[PDB]
Amino acid sequence: STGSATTTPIDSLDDAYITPVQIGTPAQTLNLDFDTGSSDLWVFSSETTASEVXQTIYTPSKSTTAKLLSGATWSISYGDGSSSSGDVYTDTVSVGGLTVTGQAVESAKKVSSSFTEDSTIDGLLGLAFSTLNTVSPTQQKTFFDNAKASLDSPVFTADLGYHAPGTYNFGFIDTTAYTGSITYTAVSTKQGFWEWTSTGYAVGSGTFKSTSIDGIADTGTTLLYLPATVVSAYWAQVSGAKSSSSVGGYVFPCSATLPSFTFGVGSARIVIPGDYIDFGPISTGSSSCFGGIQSSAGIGINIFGDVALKAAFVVFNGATTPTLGFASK
């Protein structure tokens, strides 16, 4: 079997992407944020505290296939300080025509303020390794892990758009969606992430520096977070750019024409166009814009978020030894 679903930006800044998901019998359609940096499928629900709901909800008592997982609870927090917690059902879940039976669906009892404030996101669908799942006492498998037995190949692909719709595919590689060939690189699962080592970088039309950059592929993070010395080398080539203590990163004039940024995948090279690194104005009508490349020093790990991933066709190979592939598009 295979599945194919359309993914859409939530707003004009590409802050996040949403994908439809069918839960239960008859199907209830919710728009979820597909997150390769976490491993929980959780939703707004009929159980969520009413003052914390502003979203489409899942009602397990209206699904003939829902089963309560007795004794099970969950609790998660993310890199931005947001959080949620609750209890656990198993139910039928479909994505783009691909159906899984017995999937764990984590029903929120409570959500943090940033989730209440965002009307467009009905929950998250995690696609990292199942060792990061937060259900206790026994951790639960991701949607991808449960689908592998039926899939035509144990793979999914991410094709995110720049201010445009894109696609998540399960079980096949669409050879018409990229240019050139896919280059694969080794993955470490020691911390539970799609963790890999880039071979180096170049700024604009300058020289490629061979320097190892350990980081994670995270569709749930908006920006590209890299070492302080690498980020300083990029913004040195933008004449109005400065670090702003009060805004919380590099800012620059909206009228600048920005250089591209290239990262290494083995011997291959992925080029991020300069326009992708203009995140947008600090407020509507401002002369100053926020940068899409920022220092990772406050996180402690480098993060290849949407600014980087939307420049490529990305293959998440979930064979017993996993690998990560990148192609230009």
Binding site: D15, A16, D33, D35, T36, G37, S38, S39, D40, I76, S77, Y78, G79, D80, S82, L124, G126, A128, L132, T134, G192, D218, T219, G220, T221, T222, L223, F279, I299, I303, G305
Partner: peptide, 6 residues
């Protein structure tokens, strides 16, 4: 901006 686990 979002920063999806800690």
């Amino acid at each position: 901006p979002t920063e999806x686990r800690e």
